[PDB]
């Protein structure tokens, strides 16, 4: 079993990182282009990021649902900035309009400056306490239960979502995080645990940690990985494109982003930045794993670079560890969605092997 | 100037009130029908209600934006249940995708049971205090400012909306309310004040109160009214349809029927009569300063066509010129209809 | 089995016949409204008329296909005015883009003035000869055959349709006609024979003739009927709306319309106009069968008028004769598509009974 | 004035010519992708080819009209296989539904085997005779006339198009042809004369011939050229992609590469070079009087973005300002979560 996702560039898109040269503005028409591409190419779904640097994920996903037939949408919810009852009604409404194509990404928010801008003045441990109480209300209201809940952070009385969702018991819960509070929350409530593109040894230990905590709660969680991808027909062209992606990234822009990443209260972001740390020589931190994207961009920071056989081999490495979901992205997002689907899909298991023509 | 709105029945639709007979379920397909009808008929926009009995307004409006060309969407925001910065980013994205077709309806929420279900335990005076602080943060972040704000209820530090809206300075703020705190809030921050379909004398006094308070703040507010409509070609058919609507004294004013208010629907009063009678009541409200008219009918799809074909030619421009590409008009295979 | 169709008013729509009062212009937006209504309400398909009085059927059907999911489109082809090879490629493309939702209505054209305007100067017998040779080439090219054909009217050499259709062997062929040449063509080539809304006794004889001729060709054809419908909650409201539909029809327009029909070289049009002769009194030619639409409109001319039980009863009467397809219409087409689907669908067989 | 068109690959698309490697099937979804790409990028329109090797142009164009806002469709009509009255009603209906976005490409058909497959057994001189009579009836019915016409090939009596088009007097007529019979027909009836991508000296001589014949009839025709284009940021990558396109001398003129003519593609020549070289060759053709430019690339979706992002700012208005919608803000991917792209 394997689900291959693509990515909607709600932060912005282009041919190069860091610079405005070759940039592509994010419009309704361009978002339609990427979503309808992933829909017709046969991708399982698309991940839609959230945050201050993005357009709103719920507005984007809701607008693209009537314009696609099979594509699923992994939309992010951020506990602490919205009522859990209201978030559930949004999830129910969007899941009903899409006829069961909604996927939920639980996001706790690792930037204290952005969180204070949204009105949240909570420590790292406190944010996961709100998320813990949030998900308990969210999951229960969506199953038709009039919820009475009074916790340390959230309190609802007769919380009801009158319109039931299509997917039972609720739209699947995806979650990413590397701290101990994140692994506990994932093991207790979520359905799929997501990690960024660390080397296989680091992901295997993170998966083993989550699998252990989930077993202690009598549950089993599925796993997925988030990666960039620069795949070409030959290995020489792929690494040539990787160097070309970052040719306009000055040293003062790398210092500007790293100064902002150190402000983050995120353990998952810390492990991603602990792979590059501003270096430019020796960026291949692992066989066909290139950490050049993390020099400027937040969140995901590594990419699989190589020919179709080299990239498909790295996928089997992660799949052998138990990872079943793969969320890819490329620059630019439209062109690379076709390139991955035409070079890598025939090398992947079904149904992706048979989607090529 | 006049803006004529229609209504999206996101709580549900049907042919009759009270009973489930002839009911029509709210689906994506039917919502497309009503929105695309109001879009092509030439309505200025549609009001989208909010509450526990409705589907989410932001999901529906966002889904209908790429499916319409000119129609505007009056979407409701609710302070107290969402971050003001995040609500502004939501408004910005929907306004950008729609190319300036987003209108904001500020709703405070008058049901204490529903408010407790959403996690808000605030009194009437407190609810308008959050709304006051909410709009100050909401309006300023959308104007490009990095907002630092610490009030009695809300507090943000370095609140920024990185994507600017299409409409400047922000999507217009519509607001409805009858208390003194609402009239003060409307006179200070909002752009359009909304009132229910009261008799013309009662609306004039409410408008005079808001218009007086707005002058003290150096502002002028526009006004709008929300009214159901049962218009037929003759007055006899209209009152026959009104009686049929509630078959499973009510005329509180000339051609103002309060039968819709018997149950918890969109409004509580309705204009019932022939096209000349309905246009006469509209001209009455317009003379008091009302420029926006938010209408609805049962069912909303059929009645959107009925109002637009019987009343639009009797209204000011551009609605007078919307009634009626050339060639044949009506069903022809050689002689054209004349 | 039963397939219920609706109708796209490409001639124009409105609340009243004959006059421009209460008319509704046919735009892309309004056609989207009616097509998307029939799609979501659960109708099997929509019939799209063709002719000089219509917008082009192929442009409209192709434009509405990507805007609907399940609805099928009964598009009309006219042999004699387009190449059979080209017509087949058009059908294949629309059938492929729609993923098998294309239905073909074979139209021969009964107006000699309109036919001469299109460049066809053929007698009634000759028109069915071109249609005969047209359909033979059309059906064979769509089955992957490089066709060589040299007939009295048409001649092709190496006619190929390189893109195969989705429905096999080809999109189903619907056909309407009342002449003897039409019954032969229907019995030999088409898949569904269509008739206008005549009384059940006259329809039963038309169906018996086509099934008799089809047996001599070793084939069996299915049958469908075309009707208007004015259904209300009560029988009094239905007859009140039927009288109201024709209140603005001029007596000069009645003679001017029937004068153009007396010049029509069509038996189906003559059998439909002879049910009224312009006489306005006593229009109910059968229980709940009202022939008021035929006073001005060509083609369909009768309507089922009554309460939901009366309308559903007349439908079952036609179904007992072997009619499986029902193509309904009302004025205006958008509102009345909802009215039929909400008043009559629960009284019909599945899947229409469970769609509400 | 300048109109830049793209191309809908209704015959098929892919990364390479001749081979099936990297091929891309023509589906409704992919045709939407290319059409909606040209729509948002700001192209004037798209050319839709016709023939036995294509899906029907009228079905595709009509299907794409409600899915686009400004993009125009240059749809081909072929006299001899359809009645002129019916063709006009089709043009009127599509022009009305699109609100004046329909363009007509008059195609006579140069393949006798394909013409015989469609039922036409006519010589070269005869084919242009039907086209002459076809356009005369087609143009007159669209202007509201009840047309009576009896020629050597076509005959109509009381031909009327009851629904008038949006563009007056009729959707513009584009036409391509190299024979003397074609140049006479173009100078007399059509609005835009189209030619393939010959070297600039040959195009100037063909355009002057049509302009002389048109002047003798008191008319003036506009001109357009059809070209492939392989434009990259550097000249070395462009020629590398051109060599790779046909791997499974050719530079017949400065930046004019004749590799597309090896197989039955869209045309036979291509502009290959850097953005500065391509815009220079366009300025050379534009100085001759060419106002319409119909470009294409392989694959058509990716290259529609590549030409529009590298060449549009170097072209006259409105294409120079199209590279920058009304939206403002973060132009590019956000650096971290608060640093605007440099
Ligand atoms: C696959 C994936 C997607 C994520 N998407 C987002 C996002 O859209 N917005 C965001 O603020 N954080 C996102 N994150 C980060 C986490 O949700 C969370 O904010 C951060 O990791 C803090 O958790 P931690 O301190 O336990 O590592 C994502 C993480 C992963 C693994
Ligand atoms: C259901 C139905 C639909 C028809 N639709 C058309 C049409 O769209 N255009 C048309 O010219 N004739 C139409 N006709 C009429 C016939 O197809 C035919 O063209 C004409 O009346 C000559 O046939 P006849 O002499 O055998 O009656 C239709 C007939 C039926 C029964
Ligand atoms: C821009 C352009 C586009 C053309 N498109 C087509 C087409 O789609 N199908 C086709 O058969 N011929 C096409 N042609 C060719 C002409 O229609 C015509 O068949 C050919 O020029 C033969 O005429 P000639 O002997 O006068 O040169 C095109 C020509 C040009 C210049």
Tab-separated table of C-alpha atoms in Angstrom, chain C residues 24-305:
chain	number	residue	atom	x	y	z
C	24	UNK	CA	-36.484	34.159	-21.002
C	25	UNK	CA	-33.454	34.539	-23.299
C	26	UNK	CA	-31.407	31.394	-23.864
C	27	UNK	CA	-27.848	32.134	-22.745
C	28	UNK	CA	-24.892	29.956	-21.813
C	29	UNK	CA	-25.637	30.690	-18.152
C	30	UNK	CA	-29.283	29.622	-18.441
C	31	UNK	CA	-28.417	26.473	-20.395
C	32	UNK	CA	-25.915	25.653	-17.649
C	33	UNK	CA	-28.744	26.151	-15.144
C	34	UNK	CA	-31.114	23.713	-16.856
C	35	UNK	CA	-28.461	21.113	-17.706
C	36	UNK	CA	-26.938	21.135	-14.214
C	37	UNK	CA	-30.463	20.911	-12.788
C	38	UNK	CA	-31.325	17.757	-14.742
C	39	UNK	CA	-27.885	16.351	-13.890
C	40	UNK	CA	-28.284	16.745	-10.120
C	41	UNK	CA	-32.018	15.956	-10.031
C	42	UNK	CA	-31.287	12.528	-11.517
C	43	UNK	CA	-32.717	12.712	-15.037
C	44	UNK	CA	-31.297	10.154	-17.452
C	45	UNK	CA	-30.490	12.804	-20.040
C	46	UNK	CA	-31.632	15.832	-22.003
C	47	UNK	CA	-32.843	16.056	-25.591
C	48	UNK	CA	-31.269	18.877	-27.594
C	49	UNK	CA	-33.279	19.922	-30.672
C	50	UNK	CA	-31.712	20.917	-33.975
C	51	UNK	CA	-32.755	23.086	-36.886
C	52	UNK	CA	-32.851	26.636	-38.214
C	53	UNK	CA	-34.822	27.771	-35.139
C	54	UNK	CA	-32.167	26.460	-32.719
C	55	UNK	CA	-28.657	27.202	-31.653
C	56	UNK	CA	-26.293	24.497	-32.861
C	57	UNK	CA	-26.809	21.262	-30.936
C	58	UNK	CA	-23.170	20.150	-31.074
C	59	UNK	CA	-21.767	23.415	-29.699
C	60	UNK	CA	-24.222	23.471	-26.781
C	61	UNK	CA	-23.866	19.798	-25.852
C	62	UNK	CA	-20.062	19.940	-25.951
C	63	UNK	CA	-20.042	23.086	-23.795
C	64	UNK	CA	-22.268	21.552	-21.102
C	65	UNK	CA	-20.495	18.169	-20.944
C	66	UNK	CA	-17.565	19.283	-18.700
C	67	UNK	CA	-20.080	21.037	-16.408
C	68	UNK	CA	-22.041	17.855	-15.615
C	69	UNK	CA	-21.140	14.447	-14.195
C	70	UNK	CA	-23.898	11.903	-14.907
C	71	UNK	CA	-26.325	13.572	-17.330
C	72	UNK	CA	-26.470	12.190	-20.865
C	73	UNK	CA	-26.980	14.298	-23.983
C	74	UNK	CA	-29.274	13.299	-26.854
C	75	UNK	CA	-27.636	15.296	-29.658
C	76	UNK	CA	-29.172	15.438	-33.130
C	77	UNK	CA	-27.305	14.681	-36.350
C	78	UNK	CA	-28.709	15.545	-39.777
C	79	UNK	CA	-27.606	13.387	-42.722
C	80	UNK	CA	-27.306	15.245	-46.007
C	81	UNK	CA	-25.772	18.439	-44.578
C	82	UNK	CA	-22.529	17.030	-43.118
C	83	UNK	CA	-20.069	14.350	-44.167
C	84	UNK	CA	-20.747	10.967	-42.517
C	85	UNK	CA	-17.050	10.522	-41.722
C	86	UNK	CA	-16.851	13.962	-40.100
C	87	UNK	CA	-20.107	13.394	-38.199
C	88	UNK	CA	-18.669	10.164	-36.786
C	89	UNK	CA	-15.474	11.875	-35.608
C	90	UNK	CA	-17.560	14.535	-33.850
C	91	UNK	CA	-19.618	11.853	-32.103
C	92	UNK	CA	-16.475	9.986	-31.046
C	93	UNK	CA	-14.852	13.111	-29.587
C	94	UNK	CA	-17.935	14.122	-27.592
C	95	UNK	CA	-18.516	10.533	-26.471
C	96	UNK	CA	-14.876	10.322	-25.357
C	97	UNK	CA	-14.840	13.686	-23.565
C	98	UNK	CA	-18.101	12.801	-21.788
C	99	UNK	CA	-16.940	9.234	-20.979
C	100	UNK	CA	-19.843	7.532	-22.728
C	101	UNK	CA	-22.674	10.025	-22.117
C	102	UNK	CA	-23.500	10.773	-25.775
C	103	UNK	CA	-26.786	9.764	-27.413
C	104	UNK	CA	-27.523	10.360	-31.103
C	105	UNK	CA	-30.892	11.512	-32.460
C	106	UNK	CA	-31.114	10.947	-36.217
C	107	UNK	CA	-32.948	13.873	-37.830
C	108	UNK	CA	-33.932	13.877	-41.504
C	109	UNK	CA	-35.506	17.346	-41.620
C	110	UNK	CA	-39.155	17.803	-42.548
C	111	UNK	CA	-39.171	21.453	-43.643
C	112	UNK	CA	-38.450	21.821	-47.388
C	113	UNK	CA	-37.749	25.550	-47.004
C	114	UNK	CA	-35.193	24.879	-44.261
C	115	UNK	CA	-33.631	22.027	-46.246
C	116	UNK	CA	-33.190	24.213	-49.334
C	117	UNK	CA	-31.631	26.855	-47.091
C	118	UNK	CA	-29.067	24.255	-46.012
C	119	UNK	CA	-28.372	23.251	-49.621
C	120	UNK	CA	-30.439	20.044	-49.790
C	121	UNK	CA	-32.925	19.803	-52.671
C	122	UNK	CA	-34.168	16.252	-52.128
C	123	UNK	CA	-37.582	14.635	-52.077
C	124	UNK	CA	-38.918	12.820	-49.027
C	125	UNK	CA	-37.959	9.412	-50.434
C	126	UNK	CA	-34.508	10.699	-51.390
C	127	UNK	CA	-33.857	12.185	-47.937
C	128	UNK	CA	-34.284	8.766	-46.330
C	129	UNK	CA	-31.929	7.295	-48.940
C	130	UNK	CA	-29.125	9.650	-47.870
C	131	UNK	CA	-29.927	8.887	-44.233
C	132	UNK	CA	-29.750	5.176	-45.085
C	133	UNK	CA	-26.324	5.490	-46.717
C	134	UNK	CA	-25.239	7.983	-44.038
C	135	UNK	CA	-25.964	5.639	-41.131
C	136	UNK	CA	-24.304	2.665	-42.847
C	137	UNK	CA	-21.041	4.601	-43.158
C	138	UNK	CA	-21.439	6.308	-39.768
C	139	UNK	CA	-21.962	3.050	-37.866
C	140	UNK	CA	-19.152	1.193	-39.652
C	141	UNK	CA	-16.415	3.841	-39.347
C	142	UNK	CA	-17.028	4.071	-35.590
C	143	UNK	CA	-16.357	0.319	-35.295
C	144	UNK	CA	-12.774	0.763	-36.539
C	145	UNK	CA	-13.372	-0.100	-40.204
C	146	UNK	CA	-11.782	1.801	-43.080
C	147	UNK	CA	-14.996	2.072	-45.081
C	148	UNK	CA	-15.350	2.014	-48.861
C	149	UNK	CA	-18.905	2.909	-49.863
C	150	UNK	CA	-20.411	4.064	-53.165
C	151	UNK	CA	-24.174	4.569	-53.066
C	152	UNK	CA	-26.776	6.577	-54.932
C	153	UNK	CA	-26.062	9.674	-52.809
C	154	UNK	CA	-22.897	9.216	-50.722
C	155	UNK	CA	-19.470	7.891	-51.693
C	156	UNK	CA	-16.442	7.481	-49.418
C	157	UNK	CA	-13.059	5.814	-49.907
C	158	UNK	CA	-10.840	4.923	-46.928
C	159	UNK	CA	-13.120	6.606	-44.389
C	160	UNK	CA	-11.493	6.158	-40.978
C	161	UNK	CA	-12.247	7.393	-37.464
C	162	UNK	CA	-8.902	7.072	-35.709
C	163	UNK	CA	-10.329	7.730	-32.223
C	164	UNK	CA	-12.702	4.948	-31.116
C	165	UNK	CA	-15.830	5.849	-29.127
C	166	UNK	CA	-16.424	4.845	-25.528
C	167	UNK	CA	-19.818	3.194	-25.993
C	168	UNK	CA	-19.764	0.056	-28.109
C	169	UNK	CA	-20.371	-0.348	-30.938
C	170	UNK	CA	-21.366	3.335	-31.138
C	171	UNK	CA	-23.482	5.866	-29.208
C	172	UNK	CA	-27.076	4.590	-29.248
C	173	UNK	CA	-29.150	5.756	-32.217
C	174	UNK	CA	-32.466	7.416	-31.391
C	175	UNK	CA	-34.812	8.267	-34.241
C	176	UNK	CA	-38.227	9.805	-34.742
C	177	UNK	CA	-40.505	9.629	-37.742
C	178	UNK	CA	-44.000	8.617	-38.833
C	179	UNK	CA	-43.716	8.003	-42.589
C	180	UNK	CA	-43.327	4.562	-44.142
C	181	UNK	CA	-39.727	5.366	-45.093
C	182	UNK	CA	-39.043	6.345	-41.473
C	183	UNK	CA	-40.431	3.086	-40.078
C	184	UNK	CA	-38.189	1.119	-42.451
C	185	UNK	CA	-35.091	3.115	-41.479
C	186	UNK	CA	-35.928	2.782	-37.778
C	187	UNK	CA	-36.507	-0.969	-38.078
C	188	UNK	CA	-33.194	-1.482	-39.907
C	189	UNK	CA	-30.614	0.706	-38.220
C	190	UNK	CA	-31.665	2.642	-35.107
C	191	UNK	CA	-31.721	1.457	-31.486
C	192	UNK	CA	-34.629	3.496	-30.069
C	193	UNK	CA	-37.719	4.636	-31.979
C	194	UNK	CA	-39.237	7.907	-30.770
C	195	UNK	CA	-42.790	9.168	-31.218
C	196	UNK	CA	-44.576	12.326	-30.173
C	197	UNK	CA	-47.287	12.347	-27.542
C	198	UNK	CA	-50.227	10.831	-29.384
C	199	UNK	CA	-53.031	9.012	-27.522
C	200	UNK	CA	-52.154	5.470	-26.404
C	201	UNK	CA	-54.289	3.784	-29.076
C	202	UNK	CA	-52.532	5.589	-31.935
C	203	UNK	CA	-49.104	5.053	-30.359
C	204	UNK	CA	-49.769	1.325	-29.938
C	205	UNK	CA	-50.333	0.975	-33.688
C	206	UNK	CA	-47.130	2.878	-34.477
C	207	UNK	CA	-45.176	0.666	-32.067
C	208	UNK	CA	-46.722	-2.508	-33.511
C	209	UNK	CA	-45.698	-1.473	-37.033
C	210	UNK	CA	-42.067	-0.776	-36.110
C	211	UNK	CA	-41.732	-4.014	-34.142
C	212	UNK	CA	-43.281	-5.901	-37.075
C	213	UNK	CA	-40.849	-4.407	-39.601
C	214	UNK	CA	-37.947	-4.908	-37.184
C	215	UNK	CA	-38.731	-8.631	-36.950
C	216	UNK	CA	-38.433	-8.995	-40.734
C	217	UNK	CA	-34.929	-7.512	-40.396
C	218	UNK	CA	-34.086	-9.829	-37.492
C	219	UNK	CA	-33.827	-6.940	-35.026
C	220	UNK	CA	-35.611	-5.633	-31.946
C	221	UNK	CA	-35.893	-1.897	-31.264
C	222	UNK	CA	-36.758	-0.115	-28.032
C	223	UNK	CA	-39.308	2.696	-27.932
C	224	UNK	CA	-39.611	6.167	-26.459
C	225	UNK	CA	-42.187	8.944	-26.337
C	226	UNK	CA	-41.827	12.734	-26.375
C	227	UNK	CA	-44.262	14.786	-24.306
C	228	UNK	CA	-44.743	18.070	-22.538
C	229	UNK	CA	-45.928	17.992	-18.928
C	230	UNK	CA	-47.932	20.398	-16.761
C	231	UNK	CA	-48.072	18.656	-13.370
C	232	UNK	CA	-49.261	20.409	-10.204
C	233	UNK	CA	-50.241	19.198	-6.739
C	234	UNK	CA	-53.943	19.173	-7.678
C	235	UNK	CA	-55.721	18.541	-10.963
C	236	UNK	CA	-57.391	21.965	-10.803
C	237	UNK	CA	-54.067	23.820	-10.578
C	238	UNK	CA	-52.679	21.782	-13.482
C	239	UNK	CA	-55.569	22.617	-15.812
C	240	UNK	CA	-55.457	26.221	-14.583
C	241	UNK	CA	-51.796	26.468	-15.617
C	242	UNK	CA	-52.470	24.821	-18.992
C	243	UNK	CA	-55.160	27.380	-19.828
C	244	UNK	CA	-52.845	30.141	-18.584
C	245	UNK	CA	-49.988	29.007	-20.856
C	246	UNK	CA	-51.874	29.944	-24.044
C	247	UNK	CA	-53.856	33.031	-22.979
C	248	UNK	CA	-51.735	35.382	-25.133
C	249	UNK	CA	-51.841	33.377	-28.388
C	250	UNK	CA	-53.129	35.409	-31.328
C	251	UNK	CA	-55.608	33.972	-33.810
C	252	UNK	CA	-53.432	35.362	-36.608
C	253	UNK	CA	-50.433	33.536	-35.121
C	254	UNK	CA	-52.408	30.271	-35.018
C	255	UNK	CA	-53.085	30.385	-38.761
C	256	UNK	CA	-49.562	31.623	-39.518
C	257	UNK	CA	-48.055	28.696	-37.599
C	258	UNK	CA	-50.341	26.035	-39.075
C	259	UNK	CA	-49.756	27.515	-42.539
C	260	UNK	CA	-46.050	26.740	-42.212
C	261	UNK	CA	-46.965	23.242	-41.026
C	262	UNK	CA	-49.161	22.588	-44.068
C	263	UNK	CA	-45.976	23.191	-46.086
C	264	UNK	CA	-44.041	20.709	-43.924
C	265	UNK	CA	-43.063	17.527	-45.785
C	266	UNK	CA	-43.215	15.495	-42.552
C	267	UNK	CA	-45.787	12.884	-41.562
C	268	UNK	CA	-44.952	13.180	-37.867
C	269	UNK	CA	-45.570	16.920	-38.082
C	270	UNK	CA	-48.813	16.338	-40.002
C	271	UNK	CA	-50.109	13.731	-37.543
C	272	UNK	CA	-49.308	16.169	-34.712
C	273	UNK	CA	-50.986	19.216	-36.282
C	274	UNK	CA	-54.091	17.249	-37.329
C	275	UNK	CA	-54.954	16.639	-33.655
C	276	UNK	CA	-56.229	20.221	-33.267
C	277	UNK	CA	-56.523	21.871	-36.716
C	278	UNK	CA	-56.258	25.242	-34.957
C	279	UNK	CA	-59.537	24.667	-33.102
C	280	UNK	CA	-59.252	26.097	-29.587
C	281	UNK	CA	-62.307	24.553	-27.898
C	282	UNK	CA	-62.017	21.016	-26.494
C	283	UNK	CA	-58.253	20.615	-26.450
C	284	UNK	CA	-58.163	17.604	-24.084
C	285	UNK	CA	-57.927	14.891	-26.748
C	286	UNK	CA	-57.632	12.149	-24.101
C	287	UNK	CA	-57.805	11.758	-20.293
C	288	UNK	CA	-55.129	14.182	-19.036
C	289	UNK	CA	-53.648	14.545	-22.554
C	290	UNK	CA	-53.857	18.188	-23.644
C	291	UNK	CA	-52.955	19.274	-27.188
C	292	UNK	CA	-52.602	23.002	-26.469
C	293	UNK	CA	-48.842	23.139	-27.032
C	294	UNK	CA	-49.353	22.272	-30.712
C	295	UNK	CA	-51.213	25.521	-31.416
C	296	UNK	CA	-47.948	27.381	-32.088
C	297	UNK	CA	-45.076	24.991	-31.413
C	298	UNK	CA	-43.832	22.431	-33.899
C	299	UNK	CA	-42.618	18.980	-32.958
C	300	UNK	CA	-44.164	17.935	-29.660
C	301	UNK	CA	-47.700	19.264	-29.387
C	302	UNK	CA	-49.360	17.453	-26.495
C	303	UNK	CA	-48.839	17.498	-22.742
C	304	UNK	CA	-49.797	15.393	-19.739
C	305	UNK	CA	-51.868	17.687	-17.506
